[PDB]
Each structure stands twice: as C-alpha cells, then as structure tokens.
Amino acid sequence: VDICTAKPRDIPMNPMCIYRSKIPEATNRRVWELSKANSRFATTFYQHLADSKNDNDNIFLSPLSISTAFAMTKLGACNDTLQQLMEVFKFDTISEKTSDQIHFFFAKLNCRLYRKANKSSKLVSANRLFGDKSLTFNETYQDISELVYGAKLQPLDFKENAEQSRAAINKWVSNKTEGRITDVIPSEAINELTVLVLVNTIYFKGLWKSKFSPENTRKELFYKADGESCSASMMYQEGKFRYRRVAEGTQVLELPFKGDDITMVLILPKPEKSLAKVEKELTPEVLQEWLDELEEMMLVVHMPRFRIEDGFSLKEQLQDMGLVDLFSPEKSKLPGIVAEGRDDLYVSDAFHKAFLEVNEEGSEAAASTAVVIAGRSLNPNRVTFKANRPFLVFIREVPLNTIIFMGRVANPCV
Ligand SMILES: CO[C@H]1O[C@H](COS(=O)(=O)O)[C@@H](O[C@@H]2O[C@@H](C(=O)O)[C@@H](O[C@H]3O[C@H](COS(=O)(=O)O)[C@@H](O[C@@H]4O[C@H](C(=O)O)[C@@H](O[C@H]5O[C@H](COS(=O)(=O)O)[C@@H](OC)[C@H](OC)[C@H]5OS(=O)(=O)O)[C@H](OC)[C@H]4OC)[C@H](OS(=O)(=O)O)[C@H]3OS(=O)(=O)O)[C@H](OC)[C@H]2OS(=O)(=O)O)[C@H](OS(=O)(=O)O)[C@H]1OS(=O)(=O)O
Ligand SMILES: *[C@@H]1O[C@H](CO)[C@@H](O)[C@H](O)[C@H]1NC(C)=O
Ligand SMILES: *[C@@H]1O[C@H](CO)[C@@H](O)[C@H](O)[C@H]1NC(C)=O
C-alpha cells in the first residue's frame, strides 16, 4: 500500500550500502528529525552560496528540492561518497535509526508535505529518473526510487540523442512546475557518455490570508547600486501580522497564506545596514528564535509586486561544503545504479533553478534540481545584475517547520 501509512518493517527496502553508523502533535519524532536535518543544510548551503555572490544579487532556491534529489542520488552511493553525502546534508546529526533509514522517513515527510488532506494552498512535488536506453539498471534500485520517491525511470537516448534527451527532461520539469521552470539543465550539459539523470521538482502556489488591494498599489523608482533605476510596483496594506524588531533594528515580518499551514517570513535589516551580518549568523536555531519572538501587531505593510528567478550549478558550493568524491571520476562510488556493475560512475554536474513571483493575491514559486551521472563538467553563467537593498525571503511550512523556498530579493523591479 502507500508508504504514507506503512512502517519500516512493512516494506524494508534494501539500499546498496549501509551508512557507517517538545515537537508538534500527531508528528512522528523521526520525521521531525529529518526536518531539522534538511533545515540545517538549508541554512549552511545558503551561507556558502551567499558567500559566492555579490551582496546586491538575488538568490532563490528550494533547499527541499536539493535535499530530495541528493538523497535520491544517495541510493547508489557507497563508501566515502556516501559518508560525504550523509555529512554534508546533515543526515549524520540525527539518531541512528533515522540516519540508517533516511529514504523511508523522507517519503513520510514528503507524504506530510504534499499529501495533507484539506489543503488551502497548493504544494506538489514530482521526482524522476532518466537513463540511457542501452543500459541495464539495477531493478531493486529502480523499485526503491519508484516506491520511496515516486520516481519512475524513463529511458532516453543520451548515447546518440544527448541534446534531444536534454530538451525532453526540461519539458517534463516544465510540465510539473506549471511552465515556471523550463530550462534546468543547460545546453551541452548532457552528452554521449551520460548514464542517468535524477530530477526533483517542487511547486507552491498559495493565496495570502490577508490579500493586498491593487487600487493601493503604486509605482516608484528603484535605485541600483550602480546608479541606474527601474520601476517597482510597491504594494500597500495595513493589518495585524506577527512582527518583531530584533537586534540592531532588524525587522522580521510574517505573511501567512490561507490556512496558516504555510507562511512567508521576511527579514529586513536596519534601514542602512548590511544583510551580511544576518546571513552570516544564519542558523535554524536563530531563525526559530526570531519566529518565537514574533508578536501579532497592527502595522503597515509595503512590499513589491515582483518576480525573480535564479539558476546555477551546485558543484562548486557542495565541494566547498564537503562533497568531493561524488564529482570525482576517480574517487566516486555509485555501485547501486546500473546492474552491469559499472562502478565507474560519477556525478558530472548538478543544477538548480527556482522561480518566485508575488502579487496582491499571493505568491507562486517553483524549483527543480537535476543531477547528471557522467557528462559535461561545464561552468555556467558567472554574471547577473546587482541591484541594491535586498531582503531575505522564506516560504516555510509551520507545523513541520520546513523551509520550502528561501532566498534574497535584491532586485524587485520587473
Ligand atoms: C540503537 O537503537 C536504535 O535502533 C533500534 C533498532 O531499530 S531497527 O529496527 O532498525 O533495528 C531502534 O528500536 C526500534 O525502534 C522502535 C521505535 O519506536 O522507533 C520500534 O519501531 C517500531 O515501533 C514503533 C512504535 O510502534 S507502536 O505504534 O507499536 O508503538 C514505531 O514508532 C511509531 O510510529 C508512529 C507513526 O505513525 O509513524 C508514531 O506515531 C506518531 O506519528 C504519526 C504520524 O507521523 S508523521 O506523519 O509525522 O510521520 C501520528 O499520526 C498522524 C501519530 O498520531 C497518533 C503519532 O503518535 S503520537 O503518539 O506521537 O501522537 C509513534 O509515535 C511517535 C511511533 O512510536 C514511537 C516505529 O515506526 S517508525 O518510527 O516509523 O519507525 C516502528 O518501526 S518498525 O518498522 O521498526 O517496527 C522498533 O520495534 C520493532 C524498535 O526495534 S527493537 O524492537 O529492536 O527495539 C531504536 O529506537 S528507540 O531508541 O528504541 O526508540 C534506535 O534508537 S534511536 O534511533 O537512536 O532512537
Ligand atoms: C542492486 O542494489 C542492491 C541495493 O539496493 C544490492 O543488493 C544489489 O547487489 C544490486 N544489484 C546489482 C548491482 O546488480
Ligand atoms: C502535463 O501533462 C499532463 C498529462 O500527463 C497534462 O494534464 C497537463 O496539461 C500537462 N501540463 C503542462 C504541459 O503544463
């Protein structure tokens, strides 16, 4: 039956290699743990990423999507490759059983995230495997991915139609993300020696609990660091919201969607202060403190009606975060993928692309993560606009305390 009600002993799926080792009501402790882990990676990754970008740049990702995809990749890992994945993604900072049962509890967390009855806001996810038509993949490997991640294996012809296969993958990702994410894998990323491609997609579309009125939305010039300008449709509202002015005058505002199950957190540093201090001290612990301090208050909310998108490769960051072997054609270990015992597999490169849009009605967001086993290790775009005065955005799920999307909006103009 569905793994949303099953227990580890009901369907004890056997992974390739074994790892070398209050809370909310009606919530299984271990699922809560997984949330802590994923959040511990969310914050950490952002810090490395925000470190490799100009403070006046937009940043937008879905740590959830990245974690899900890499946990999927973890099925075929083994030895030091596996040890690295566990550590980097915080899968080792939890109890023994949960650590040794990641996939199953990820299935459970996901069940809670996307299969929750009576859903006021739309949150859906889709996973998928794309493998070369000529190879013979491990049956158990497929079965477990399909069972736990709902990721079926679609055969594509990378061997002779690499580029065409790429467009196919992207078209699938667009389909799942409502046409928001249409180009996750860059051109020439996939080539003749490509074996498999693991993909995850997350899509959120909710309505504000307290919507904004378009007759109050105005326009004003936004001044960029360089000296230029652009038009920004600044939304206005007045109502009660959980707010809190913290250390050094940093404002924290929460915008709950219909149902309060999911909410948007906005962190605005002091009127003429660097967000850098905030970002550097970003820990799930601090994030929790802020939200715990928020007190429902009456206030005037001003926020731009905008749209941002951010796409990038994950290789550089993850390596600087501990993941080395997985990308090394000499030290990588992925024995549990193809039945042919081809233990020469390595992840060539990984990509991510997110989308964010906000208006008087609500906020839409989509994200994807494409992991390519064997291919073209290219270095994507190294330049994007640097506007000015950015604020941090978080799209979290209240009960599970999970960070769905997270980023920094530096350019609100469109
Ligand atoms: C070194 O020690 C470590 O390893 C050993 C060996 O494990 S091994 O099997 O891998 O070798 C561990 O010992 C095993 O673990 C036990 C455990 O409870 O964790 C036990 O597991 C099995 O039985 C438990 C209890 O079942 S019971 O229902 O009969 O009591 C079971 O856990 C329950 O799962 C429920 C669930 O539905 O998931 C929980 O319900 C709550 O959550 C649901 C929904 O959650 S979610 O949607 O958020 O996901 C909610 O419904 C909406 C409920 O609402 C009513 C919630 O209940 S409420 O009361 O909280 O409101 C139960 O409550 C939390 C929960 O009980 C704790 C477990 O399922 S699992 O947790 O999903 O795995 C089940 O797994 S099984 O498949 O293995 O059976 C094992 O007994 C068989 C036990 O093996 S033993 O017999 O050899 O000891 C060590 O665990 S522990 O330390 O002993 O706890 C482990 O240590 S640690 O990992 O370091 O902590
Ligand atoms: C398939 O993977 C499983 C672990 O999930 C392992 O038991 C088995 O040896 C593998 N079979 C192969 C590579 O043919
Ligand atoms: C995605 O494909 C399904 C059929 O599987 C169809 O219902 C839907 O309209 C498609 N969505 C797109 C192309 O955005």
UniProtKB/Swiss-Prot annotation:
According to the record, which residues are glycosylated? 79, 118, 138, 175
SUPFAM superfamilies in alphabetical order: Serpins (SSF56574)
Tell me what effect the entry lists for residue 49 to P.
In AT3D; type-I
Entry GO CC: blood microparticle; collagen-containing extracellular matrix; endoplasmic reticulum lumen; extracellular exosome; extracellular region; extracellular space; plasma membrane
List this protein's GO terms for biological process. blood coagulation; regulation of blood coagulation
Impact reported for residue 376 to H: In AT3D; type-II; Glasgow/Sheffield/Chicago/Avranches/Kumamoto-2; increases affinity for heparin; deprived of inhibitory activity
What's the impact of mutating residue 385 to L? Answer: In AT3D; type-II; Maisons-Laffite
What GO terms are given for molecular function?
A: heparin binding; identical protein binding; protease binding; serine-type endopeptidase inhibitor activity
Q: Which residues form a coiled coil?
A: none
Impact when changing residue 365 to K: Reduces interaction with thrombin by 99%
**CDD domains linked:** serpinC1_AT3
Q: What is the effect of changing residue 3 to N?
A: In AT3D; type-II; Rouen-3; lack of heparin-binding properties
Q: For binding heparin, which residues are annotated in this chain's numbering? A: 32, 112, 128
Substituting residue 112 to Q results in: In AT3D; type-II; Geneva
Outcome of swapping residue 40 to C: In AT3D; type-I
The effect of residue 170 to D is: In AT3D; type-II; Rouen-6; increases affinity for heparin
Name the consequence of residue 389 to G. Answer: In AT3D; uncertain significance; type I and type-II
Stated consequence of mutating residue 97 to E: In AT3D; Dreux; complete loss af heparin binding
What does the annotation give as the result of altering residue 46 to C?
A: In AT3D; type-I
Query: According to UniProt, where does the site described as Reactive bond lie?
Result: 376-377
Disulfide pairs here are 4-111, 17-78, 230-413
According to its UniProt entry, the function of this protein is described as: Most important serine protease inhibitor in plasma that regulates the blood coagulation cascade. AT-III inhibits thrombin, matriptase-3/TMPRSS7, as well as factors IXa, Xa and XIa. Its inhibitory activity is greatly enhanced in the presence of heparin.
- Name the chain's protein: Antithrombin-III
Which organism is the protein's source? Homo sapiens
